[PDB]
Structure formats: structure tokens, C-alpha cells
Amino acid sequence: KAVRRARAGLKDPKRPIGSFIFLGPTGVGKTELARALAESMFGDDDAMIRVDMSEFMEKHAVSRLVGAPPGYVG
Amino acid sequence: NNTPTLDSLARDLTVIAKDGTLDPVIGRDKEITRVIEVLSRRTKNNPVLIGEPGVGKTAIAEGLAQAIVNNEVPETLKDKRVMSLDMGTVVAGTKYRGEFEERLKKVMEEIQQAGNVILFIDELHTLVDASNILKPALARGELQCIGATTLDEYRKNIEKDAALERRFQPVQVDEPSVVDTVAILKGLRDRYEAHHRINISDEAIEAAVKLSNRYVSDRFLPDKAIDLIDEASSKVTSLSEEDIAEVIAGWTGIPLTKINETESEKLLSLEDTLHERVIGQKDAVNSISKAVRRARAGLKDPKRPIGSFIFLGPTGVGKTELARALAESMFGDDDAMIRVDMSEFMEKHLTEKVRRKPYSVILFDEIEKAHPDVFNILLQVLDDGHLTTVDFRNTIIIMTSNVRFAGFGRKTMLKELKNSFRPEFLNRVDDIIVFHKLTKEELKEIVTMMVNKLTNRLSEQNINIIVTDKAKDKIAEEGYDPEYGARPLIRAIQKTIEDNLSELILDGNQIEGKKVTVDHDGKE
Amino acid sequence: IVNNEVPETLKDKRVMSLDMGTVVAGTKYRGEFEERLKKVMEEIQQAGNVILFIDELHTLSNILKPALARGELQCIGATTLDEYRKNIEKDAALERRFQPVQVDEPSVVDTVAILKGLRDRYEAHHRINISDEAIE
Ligand SMILES: Nc1ncnc2c1ncn2[C@@H]1O[C@H](COP(=O)(O)OP(=O)(O)O)[C@@H](O)[C@H]1O
Ligand SMILES: Nc1ncnc2c1ncn2[C@@H]1O[C@H](COP(=O)(O)OP(=O)(O)O)[C@@H](O)[C@H]1O
């Protein structure tokens, strides 16, 4: 419904197409469903942008998302 | 009519096209058409051919020159010259004011007054000093350019200045497939036969393509295959795969018999070539040979790695030398082993190595000590087969490991692995291998190996070392430890030989080929 | 070449060595050097049989391009890896035309063999005998 609402031109221009939390047990399909969506949109699983939050265990890991402040390395 | 300075320092491509000497350009019709439509623009009509080195970027400009001569271009281009301007000595006086801009403006005004030049500028990124001279002429439309650069150079230089992006349009040039490279070679065949006066078989073409794709990673098709077939037909009635393999042996140093052996005969002889390098560990060698045969039988998903093995045994008793034997046998060199450094995973709080060497054994030294981020990378390699692209399907993954009774007082390690690692990851290793604590006779056969590797090495100094088996036998004590064995022996061979002979012949005597016959004195 | 040991496919090739000092020697004005270069390149194009040797090649693409364009100047040269890493690798128009040949560091044995050959004319210059074992 979100994908169709986007391509139909009804999506609010200022907001992303959709944002979803997939909550459930381990090994139930909720990463595979994202992979299948990416495949259906781009023909390949590899076009997904995958962020592994387990490495972001510290607050300063946030620099990997948005960069290092002026004067800091990288 | 004429452009006297430009004609001195630019290779005229369209005249070489009319002179028939230019080689054919095959299959690049999409890229040529994209260049045509970019050139027809009114404003930013300057294509940049973006692609890896050697993929055919200049061949697009030469195909354009052919299209112009062959009247295939639209009428807007029917008469334009294509001039490959070389930067090499457009810089010539790096200190003086204006000496660069002098001859640059001279070339540019010649190109202006002869308003029918298309200029090809290879390594365009090297211009970004000149940009302030080109921007006004480009804006004025007098000069029309084809650039060529790598993608990373483009991002590093041209993308950063919006005023350059406001003048140049990117055209992606990709490395052709094996099929396209074959079609290229089959076109160029006749033109190379006319030079070498040798027949070139189709099987030699496909062999050259395959072997350039499998033994020369750091270079790209078609240039690899062209270079290979050219140097082979130089080395040579007709060309054949044996000459291709000989040239690959030249470029790699790999022995020719290792190169031209089939997959099957390679993996059949495998475990003998393992046994003779490692000594002992019969169960481990049989396990790894069984597992790799099972993988290469070809039923497994061809995107997944060839193997994934955990080594449990004590210390250094044979793990690393078995990994090096596996890399030597499966892929052709000890240099086919990559030792991963775990610091890369800590550093955020390998990929560019695999890019260079995809036929390699990947060794994880003591995976227990790694950052637990390593398991994300491991799982990603072991399930998808690719990272960022870099592809692991040809690699073998080896992960090494080393996993008091307060009282009056061969299966435990299989237990303790389960709880010492993430079991969801142990669900995905292909096999688990246990190394035994080696026997004394195996250890002294190692000593016969190392003493031979010293004797023949010393023999390069004309020092014909000779040794008595019983003397080596009675150094088998000199490093037998419950913790380790294949290491302390290395601190025995130099004391028992090198320093022993440093007392016995190097001083107070003199080195001669006779008493370097080590006779057993009854003790050592 | 002079032994005619080279392939029968190129016995006619003549090897010659170009020194910039000689080419500038006695030039009296600017551009005379460059035009003497251009006319010797034209003579090279007419002859077709030449092969040109250029030591200290790193002293050199464009000014000799008119005969590197198609490769009318068949070229052989020597350089150190230092004076190769920094320049000859760093011009695509050279990497399109040159091929590096590494000349190996020789063994002790080969160096004493070449010595005990070439020794005979240094004996001549000194009028002294060289012990072959003192060489080794
Ligand atoms: N409902 C399902 N349909 C199809 N395949 C599934 C389903 N649930 C799990 N799987 C399979 O098992 C794996 C499930 O991974 P997944 O459950 O997406 O990881 P997680 O949910 O723990 O992030 C995938 O390889 C997928 O093929
Ligand atoms: N379509 C093609 N037809 C014939 N030869 C080609 C083709 N594409 C590339 N080549 C060959 O590849 C070699 C390298 O050319 P190129 O990749 O343009 O060099 P560069 O690294 O400057 O881009 C040349 O010898 C060229 O003839």
C-alpha cells in the first residue's frame, strides 16, 4: 500500500515514502521481506542500503551516519 | 584549413580512420550513440567517458572517429576532426608565469578559428590549474571536449567543482563481459595475424580471456586478453593454449604444470600434496579434502564461498602450515593466503585485499580475540557471497581458535565451541576440524624437513651440509612441550648446527666441504 | 644485431643512441634544437629501419609524440624504478606505448664471470695481472 500510494502520486511530497518497524521473533521473515521489497523495486537485493545497528552500540558511533564534526578526523 | 601547433602535439584520429589503419571498434554502439546525443546538446555538450583503466575509453573516441569517416554520424558532425590532445608536455615550464597559459591559449585559439575540431582529452582530471582558462571557452562554445577519467578521480576532482560539472556530462563505460571480450578478440584476430603471420585459434582466444580473467586481477578486459595474445603470438603453424599458459607462468611466476592442470586432477591429488607438506594430522587432512571435494562437486550455490572451516587444536602445531598447503595446492602459491588483521574491526570504534586476490585462502587468526563485529562480516560473506563490489565465491574461509580442578584428584572441545561462540554462527560453518598433539616421530620428520631446507640453502654457499639421522633423533628432546612443538624446534636447529659449526669450523678452523659431514658423536 | 643473432625477421634494423648534449651542441638560437629534432624525426620516419636508444629516458611525450603517435619512433630505454614510479607510470600516453623490462640483480657467479672476461682489457690499461680468485 505504501509503494502504490507513492507511485500513484498521493505521497506527501515532504515525507519519505514510508517508515516501518518490523517487530517479532527471531527468524520470521522481517529482514527477508525488506530484501524482497528491494528486489521488487530494483531487480537486485544488492541495491539495499543495509545499516547494522549492533555495531552502533555506542553513542559516538553516530558519526558514521552523518560524519565527523569540523576539525575531527574524517 | 590548418592548425599548426595543434597538429604538432595531438594525434589526429580521423585521418588515421580515413587511412584505414585504425583498428575496428566492436559492440560499443550504445556508448558511441550516447556520445553522439551528448555532442548534439546546445550547452553542456562535453562527454566524459568514465570507466576503469583499460576498459575501452579511448576505443569510444576511435569508434566515434570511424562513425564520422563512415558518414554514420548525423549531419551536425559530418565534417569534424577528432584530435587526441596529449597533456604530457602541455606543461613544460612549471615555474614561469603564463608559459602554461601561453601555449594553452595558442592551442585554444587555433581550435576556435578552425571551428570544426572535437578534442579528446585523456586523464581529464589532471587539468584540475587550467580550469580557469577552459571554463570561459567552454561557456562560449568554441571548444568541445571528450574527457576520459576513472570514476574515483571524477568524484575526487571534477564533481567537487560545480562549475566543471556544469560543463561536462558523465558517460559510464563498463568492463565488457567475457562474451564481449571474445567478440573483440575474434574481430582483432585478423589484424594481429597480419602482424605476426601466425594463425590464431578460437580456443587460444578463449584460453587467453579465461586466464587473464583468473590470474591477472589488477587489470581489466579487453586489455588483459589483448596483451596476453599479443605477447604469446610474439613468443611464437598456429597459436595454442600451451603458449598462453607459458605467458601466464611468466606474468605470475606460478609453475606451468600448476597452471595447465585440470580442476579434477588438481583436487584428486590434493590430499597427497597436503600430507607431504604438513605431516601427520591424518584426520584433519582427510576432513578438509573431503569437504573441498564435496564443495567442488558443483551442486553448491556458485555464489557461496568454496569452504568455511574452524580449526580447534593446540597453538601452532599445524594449523598455519595446513592453511598454506591448502592455498598452495588449490590456488597455486603461498602468496594466495590472506591473513586478516583484527585491528580493522576495532578501528571503527581486507575488502581492498580481496579485490586484489579473489582466489585466496582467508585466514582469521584466533577469531576469539576479534571484535564481535567480525561475525556480521563473516555471516554476510557466508550467506550473500559479496561485500562492499567484492566477491568471495572463490575464497576459502578458515577461522582458527584455541578453546584448575580444586580437588584432591577428545569430545570436550566439540562441546565448548558451542557455548564459547554465537551458536547461530556455528550453524553456518561448513565443517569443524580438530588437531591432535603430534607424535615424536612426526616431530623429528619435521626436523628432517627443516634440516633439509637448511642444508640445501647452505649448499648455495657450497657448504655441502651432511647430517646423521641419529643426531637429529637426539635433538627431538630440544623443544618437545605439552603446549607446542612446531615452534621450539626452530630454536634448536641453529644451536645444534649453525652455532655448533660456528664453534667447530667457522673459527679456529676454516669452512670446508668435508667435516661439514655431521657425524653423530653419540650425544648430538 | 652485429652478430646477426637477432631474428631473421629484423636483421635490417639499425640501433643508434641519441644524446641531448650532442643535439643541443652548436645550436645558436631557440627553436633550432626543436627543428633539428623534428627533421631527425622526419628522417627516422623516412628510414623506417631505425631503432632508437635513449638512456636516462626520464629526461623525456608530446614533443616526440609525432613519432610516438603511431610508434614510428621504435624506442628502447633505461631508467631506475624511482625515476619510473614518479613519471612513466604517471602518463597514460606512455603506458600505452612502453613496456617495463626488469633487469635482474645478477649473482656473484655471473659477476665474476663477466669480470674475468672484461678483466683482460683492464689488465691492458694497467699492464698488470688480475688473480681470478682475488676477483671472486
Ligand atoms: N516467512 C518466511 N518466508 C520465507 N522465508 C523465510 C520466512 N521466515 C524465515 N525465512 C528464511 O529464513 C531466513 C530468515 O531471516 P530473517 O527471519 O529475515 O532474519 P531476522 O528476522 O532474524 O532479521 C531467511 O533466509 C529466509 O529465507
Ligand atoms: N570495442 C573495442 N574494439 C577493439 N579494441 C578495443 C575495444 N575496446 C577496447 N579495445 C582495446 O583495449 C585497449 C585499451 O584501450 P583503452 O581501454 O581505450 O585504453 P585506456 O586505458 O586509455 O582507456 C586498446 O588496445 C583497444 O584497442
Short mmCIF file of C-alpha atoms in Angstrom, two decimals, chain B residues 163-350:
data_model
loop_
_atom_site.label_atom_id
_atom_site.label_comp_id
_atom_site.label_asym_id
_atom_site.label_seq_id
_atom_site.Cartn_x
_atom_site.Cartn_y
_atom_site.Cartn_z
CA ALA B 163 31.39 24.75 -12.47
CA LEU B 164 33.09 21.72 -14.04
CA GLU B 165 30.00 19.55 -13.59
CA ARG B 166 28.09 22.43 -15.17
CA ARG B 167 30.15 21.81 -18.34
CA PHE B 168 30.79 18.04 -18.55
CA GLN B 169 28.29 15.18 -18.84
CA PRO B 170 29.22 11.74 -17.48
CA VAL B 171 29.13 8.66 -19.71
CA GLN B 172 29.59 5.36 -17.87
CA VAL B 173 31.90 2.89 -19.63
CA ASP B 174 31.88 -0.59 -18.06
CA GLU B 175 34.22 -3.54 -18.43
CA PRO B 176 32.86 -5.84 -21.17
CA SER B 177 31.74 -9.37 -20.34
CA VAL B 178 33.65 -12.50 -21.31
CA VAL B 179 31.32 -12.83 -24.32
CA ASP B 180 32.01 -9.26 -25.43
CA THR B 181 35.75 -9.74 -24.91
CA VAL B 182 35.61 -12.87 -27.07
CA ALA B 183 33.81 -10.93 -29.82
CA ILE B 184 36.50 -8.24 -29.55
CA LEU B 185 39.33 -10.77 -29.84
CA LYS B 186 37.65 -12.56 -32.76
CA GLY B 187 37.44 -9.22 -34.54
CA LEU B 188 41.05 -8.21 -33.85
CA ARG B 189 42.34 -11.69 -34.79
CA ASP B 190 42.89 -10.92 -38.48
CA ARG B 191 44.63 -7.62 -37.74
CA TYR B 192 47.03 -9.38 -35.37
CA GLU B 193 47.59 -12.27 -37.79
CA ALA B 194 48.62 -9.69 -40.39
CA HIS B 195 51.41 -8.62 -38.00
CA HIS B 196 52.61 -11.94 -36.55
CA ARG B 197 51.83 -14.03 -39.67
CA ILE B 198 50.61 -16.82 -37.39
CA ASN B 199 47.21 -18.49 -37.23
CA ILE B 200 45.28 -17.84 -34.01
CA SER B 201 42.80 -20.50 -32.90
CA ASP B 202 39.48 -19.75 -31.23
CA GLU B 203 40.44 -21.94 -28.28
CA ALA B 204 43.57 -19.85 -27.77
CA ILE B 205 41.36 -16.75 -27.70
CA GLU B 206 39.05 -18.21 -25.06
CA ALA B 207 42.01 -19.55 -23.07
CA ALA B 208 43.62 -16.11 -23.10
CA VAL B 209 40.39 -14.47 -21.93
CA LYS B 210 39.83 -17.02 -19.16
CA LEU B 211 43.43 -16.93 -17.92
CA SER B 212 43.65 -13.14 -18.00
CA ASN B 213 40.41 -13.13 -16.01
CA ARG B 214 41.69 -15.65 -13.46
CA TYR B 215 45.40 -14.85 -12.99
CA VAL B 216 45.67 -11.07 -13.61
CA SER B 217 43.26 -9.37 -11.20
CA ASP B 218 44.62 -5.82 -11.13
CA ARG B 219 43.93 -5.22 -14.83
CA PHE B 220 40.74 -5.23 -16.89
CA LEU B 221 39.33 -6.75 -20.06
CA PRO B 222 39.79 -6.45 -23.00
CA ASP B 223 43.28 -5.01 -22.44
CA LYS B 224 44.37 -8.09 -20.48
CA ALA B 225 43.39 -10.51 -23.24
CA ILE B 226 44.86 -8.30 -25.96
CA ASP B 227 48.18 -8.04 -24.13
CA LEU B 228 48.20 -11.78 -23.46
CA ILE B 229 47.51 -12.84 -27.04
CA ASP B 230 49.97 -10.25 -28.40
CA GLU B 231 52.85 -11.35 -26.16
CA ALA B 232 52.03 -15.01 -26.80
CA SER B 233 51.99 -14.62 -30.58
CA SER B 234 55.27 -12.75 -30.15
CA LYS B 235 56.73 -15.68 -28.19
CA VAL B 236 55.87 -17.86 -31.18
CA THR B 237 51.92 -23.16 -37.57
CA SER B 238 49.48 -21.65 -35.09
CA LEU B 239 48.96 -20.37 -31.56
CA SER B 240 47.81 -22.75 -28.84
CA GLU B 241 46.82 -22.79 -25.17
CA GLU B 242 50.26 -24.03 -24.06
CA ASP B 243 51.84 -20.73 -25.16
CA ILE B 244 49.13 -18.82 -23.28
CA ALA B 245 49.87 -20.84 -20.15
CA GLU B 246 53.61 -20.22 -20.60
CA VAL B 247 52.97 -16.47 -20.73
CA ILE B 248 50.76 -16.69 -17.64
CA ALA B 249 53.61 -18.52 -15.90
CA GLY B 250 55.80 -15.61 -16.96
CA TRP B 251 53.47 -12.95 -15.58
CA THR B 252 52.68 -14.80 -12.32
CA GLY B 253 55.69 -16.97 -11.52
CA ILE B 254 53.29 -19.88 -11.00
CA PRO B 255 54.76 -23.14 -12.37
CA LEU B 256 53.25 -24.10 -15.70
CA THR B 257 52.14 -27.57 -14.60
CA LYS B 258 50.16 -25.94 -11.79
CA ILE B 259 48.56 -23.58 -14.31
CA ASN B 260 47.52 -26.03 -17.03
CA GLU B 261 46.35 -28.88 -14.79
CA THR B 262 42.61 -29.50 -14.83
CA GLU B 263 40.33 -28.82 -11.87
CA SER B 264 39.64 -32.53 -11.36
CA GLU B 265 43.23 -33.79 -11.38
CA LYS B 266 44.19 -30.88 -9.12
CA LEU B 267 41.62 -31.79 -6.46
CA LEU B 268 42.24 -35.55 -6.79
CA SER B 269 45.96 -35.26 -5.99
CA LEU B 270 45.12 -32.70 -3.27
CA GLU B 271 45.49 -34.72 -0.08
CA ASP B 272 48.86 -36.19 -1.06
CA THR B 273 50.15 -32.64 -1.62
CA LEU B 274 48.70 -31.72 1.78
CA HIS B 275 50.17 -34.73 3.63
CA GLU B 276 53.63 -34.21 2.16
CA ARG B 277 53.68 -30.55 3.27
CA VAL B 278 52.08 -30.82 6.72
CA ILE B 279 52.99 -34.32 8.01
CA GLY B 280 50.55 -36.03 10.40
CA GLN B 281 47.05 -34.78 11.19
CA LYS B 282 45.62 -37.57 9.02
CA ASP B 283 42.06 -36.94 10.21
CA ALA B 284 42.26 -33.18 9.61
CA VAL B 285 43.67 -33.57 6.10
CA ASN B 286 41.09 -36.21 5.16
CA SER B 287 38.34 -33.95 6.54
CA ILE B 288 39.42 -30.86 4.60
CA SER B 289 39.97 -32.87 1.41
CA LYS B 290 36.52 -34.46 1.74
CA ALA B 291 34.87 -31.09 2.38
CA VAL B 292 36.56 -29.30 -0.53
CA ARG B 293 35.81 -32.21 -2.89
CA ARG B 294 32.18 -32.06 -1.73
CA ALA B 295 32.06 -28.33 -2.45
CA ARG B 296 33.75 -28.55 -5.87
CA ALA B 297 31.35 -31.31 -6.99
CA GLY B 298 29.36 -28.32 -8.21
CA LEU B 299 25.93 -28.76 -6.61
CA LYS B 300 26.51 -25.91 -4.16
CA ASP B 301 25.36 -22.38 -4.88
CA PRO B 302 28.16 -20.97 -7.08
CA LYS B 303 27.96 -17.59 -5.32
CA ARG B 304 28.85 -19.03 -1.91
CA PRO B 305 32.46 -19.44 -0.74
CA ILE B 306 34.25 -22.70 -1.54
CA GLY B 307 34.59 -23.53 2.15
CA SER B 308 34.36 -22.49 5.78
CA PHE B 309 36.44 -24.32 8.38
CA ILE B 310 37.11 -23.95 12.12
CA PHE B 311 40.45 -25.18 13.49
CA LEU B 312 40.30 -26.12 17.17
CA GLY B 313 43.61 -27.75 18.05
CA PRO B 314 46.60 -26.65 20.11
CA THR B 315 48.50 -23.48 19.20
CA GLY B 316 50.59 -23.62 16.03
CA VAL B 317 51.04 -27.39 15.86
CA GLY B 318 50.00 -27.47 12.21
CA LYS B 319 47.18 -25.03 11.51
CA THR B 320 49.04 -22.30 9.61
CA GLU B 321 51.15 -24.75 7.59
CA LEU B 322 47.99 -26.65 6.62
CA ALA B 323 46.41 -23.36 5.55
CA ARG B 324 49.47 -22.53 3.45
CA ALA B 325 49.45 -26.04 1.96
CA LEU B 326 45.77 -25.61 1.07
CA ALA B 327 46.48 -22.26 -0.59
CA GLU B 328 49.49 -23.67 -2.45
CA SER B 329 47.52 -26.66 -3.75
CA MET B 330 44.12 -25.11 -4.51
CA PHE B 331 45.29 -21.79 -5.96
CA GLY B 332 48.99 -22.09 -6.81
CA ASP B 333 51.05 -20.08 -4.30
CA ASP B 334 51.66 -19.50 -0.63
CA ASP B 335 51.13 -15.85 -1.61
CA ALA B 336 47.48 -16.88 -2.14
CA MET B 337 46.95 -16.68 1.64
CA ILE B 338 45.48 -13.54 3.20
CA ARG B 339 45.99 -13.07 6.94
CA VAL B 340 43.19 -10.82 8.19
CA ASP B 341 44.25 -8.28 10.81
CA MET B 342 41.59 -7.94 13.52
CA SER B 343 42.53 -4.30 14.16
CA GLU B 344 40.39 -3.28 11.17
CA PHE B 345 37.30 -4.23 13.20
CA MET B 346 38.41 -2.39 16.35
CA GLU B 347 39.38 0.67 14.27
CA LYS B 348 35.74 1.66 13.73
CA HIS B 349 35.26 2.16 17.49
CA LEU B 350 40.53 -6.86 3.97
#
